[PDB]
Amino acid sequence: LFPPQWICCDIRYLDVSILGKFAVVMADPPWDIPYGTLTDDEMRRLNIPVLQDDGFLFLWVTGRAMELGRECLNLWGYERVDEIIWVKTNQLQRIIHWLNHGKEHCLVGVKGNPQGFNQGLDCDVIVAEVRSTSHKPDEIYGMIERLSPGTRKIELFGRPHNVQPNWITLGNQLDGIHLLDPDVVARFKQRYPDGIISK
Amino acid sequence: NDYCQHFVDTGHRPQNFIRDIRLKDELIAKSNTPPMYLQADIEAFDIRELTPKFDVILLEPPLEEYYRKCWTWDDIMKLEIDEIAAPRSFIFLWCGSGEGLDLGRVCLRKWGYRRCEDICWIKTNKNNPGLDPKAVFQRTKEHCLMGIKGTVDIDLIITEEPEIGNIEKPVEIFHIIEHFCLGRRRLHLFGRDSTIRPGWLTVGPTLTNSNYNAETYASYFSAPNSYLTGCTEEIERL
Ligand SMILES: Nc1ncnc2c1ncn2[C@@H]1O[C@H](CSCC[C@H](N)C(=O)O)[C@@H](O)[C@H]1O
Ligand SMILES: [Mg+2]
C-alpha cells in the first residue's frame, strides 16, 4: 500500500514471512567490521530467502563486508550482477588504510528471473552529498523506482528518514508500527496478536 | 540536484559533475630501475622464468568485455601468480565491471592475498552525452583490486571514457601504486609497448621488443639495495 509503512523490530527475530513478496530488497546492515552490530553468523542466518521470488537485492557494503556481503548474497540465493558506487561529495560537488576512501559500494543481486524491470535506465555511479553518519543517498530510491515502478519494496535496517512510498521499512530505531496493507495487517495480527516481537 | 535523474533526462553521467609530493615523485624517479620488458605469450610461458620474486604485480588480462587473444577468468585463475610473488608483496588486478568483480576476488585469495582496497576507475562522458544481459544499470566504471600478502591518494580515478577499441587503463594507476613505496621489483603482466615505464618490468604477448635478462634484472636489487622502498635516496657507491 502506497504510503510509507514500517515496523520497529529486531530483524534477527521478526518473522518476515508475514510481509509477503517484494520486487526489490535493500539493506544497510550494521556489519561487524554509533549503533549495535550483527555478527557474521547473524547476518548469514537472516531469512532473506522468503522475501522474494523474482527480483533484485541492493546490499550496502564496506571494508571486509565487500567479501562477507558477497558471501551472504550468494547464501541467500542471489547472483551479484551489478555494483553501484556512491561518490561522496560536499555541497560543492567535491569528493570528501592504504588509500583515502571517496565512495561506498552497494552490491546488486538478482534472484530468479525478473520480468518487466526497466534495466539500463540509470547508470551505476551516484554522485551525492554526504549527510549524517551512515545516511545513504536518497537518489537510490529514485533509481529503484524507475527500475521497478509501483511495485512493493522492503528496506532492512532503515531509520525514520528512510521510510518511502511503496516501501516497508524494518529497523530497531523506527518508532512503533505503521502498517496499511490489509494483507500485511491481517497476517501481522495473526502472528503477533499481542503486538510483541520476541525470540 | 539529483544527478541520477539528470542522467536519465540528458545522458550526462553523474560523474561529469564532480568538481576538481613533487620531491617524492622525484625520489621515485631517482630510485626507478631502467624499464625492462619481455615479449611472452603468457598462456605458453613458464612465469617462473620471471625472477626475482616481485614486490608489486600489476595484472591487466585482456578481458573480452573490454572489446565492444582475450583471456577468460578460467584462464586467469589458473595463472600461478603465487609462484613469483614475494612473501610480502602486493597485487593490483584490473577486474572490469562484470563477473570479474567476484572472480578477481577468488583469484586474489587463490594466490594468497587479501584485498585491502577497491580502486574504481570512473569514466565521464562529457564529450559524448547519451550491455551485458544480466546488467541492471549502465556500467560506467571499472575496478582495480589491491591485494596484500604477508605482513595521499584516494580510491578513485576519474577520466573521460576512451574512444571505442582503446583498451588502455589510466596511467594514474601507476601513480597510486608508486606512491605507496612498496619496493622496486615491479611487474606488469599483459602490459604493452605503450605501457612500458621506468621502474617496471613489463611482460606481455604484444610487445614488439624485449630487453629482459634475469641476471641483469636481479643485479638492480642486489645488496645494498635489496630492501629499498623506491621512495628513498639512492645508496652511495665508491
Ligand atoms: N538487530 C537489529 N534489528 C534491526 N535494526 C538494527 C539491529 N541492529 C542494528 N540495527 C539498526 O540498523 C541501522 C544501521 S544504520 C542504517 C542507515 C540507513 N540505511 C540510513 O540511510 O540512514 C541502525 O539504525 C541500527 O540501530
Ligand atoms: Mg527485462
Author numbering:
A (entry chain A): 368 to 400, 405 to 467, 474 to 576
B (entry chain B): 117 to 136, 153 to 200, 209 to 270, 275 to 295, 309 to 395
Article excerpt on this structure:
The m6A RNA modification is catalyzed in the nucleus by a multiprotein writer complex containing the putative methyltransferases METTL3 and METTL14. The m6A writer complex catalyzes the transfer of a methyl group from the donor substrate S-adenosyl methionine (SAM) to the adenine nucleobases in acceptor RNA substrates. Crucially, our structural and biochemical data imply that METTL3 is the sole catalytic subunit of the complex, while METTL14 plays non-catalytic roles in complex stabilization and substrate RNA recruitment. The structures of the METTL3-METTL14 complex reveal that the two methyltransferase subunits form a compact pseudosymmetric heterodimer with overall dimensions of 80 × 40 × 35 Å.
The truncated METTL3-METTL14 complex was crystallized and its structure solved by a single-wavelength anomalous diffraction approach utilizing the anomalous signal of native sulfur atoms. Experimentally-phased electron density maps revealed the presence of a single molecule of the donor product S-adenosyl homocysteine (SAH), serendipitously co-purified with the complex, in the METTL3 active site. High-resolution native data were subsequently measured from a METTL3-METTL14 crystal grown in the presence of SAH and a short m6A-containing oligonucleotide. However, the RNA oligonucleotide was not evident in electron density maps. Comparisons with the structure of the SAH product-bound complex reveal that the both SAM and SAH molecules adopt very similar conformations except for a slight rotation of the ribose moiety in SAH. Additional ordering of ASL1 is observed in the SAH-bound structure, whereby Tyr406METTL3 caps the SAH product and makes a hydrogen bonding interaction with Ser511METTL3 in ASL2. No additional electron density attributable to SAM or SAH could be observed in the proximity of METTL14 in the two structures.
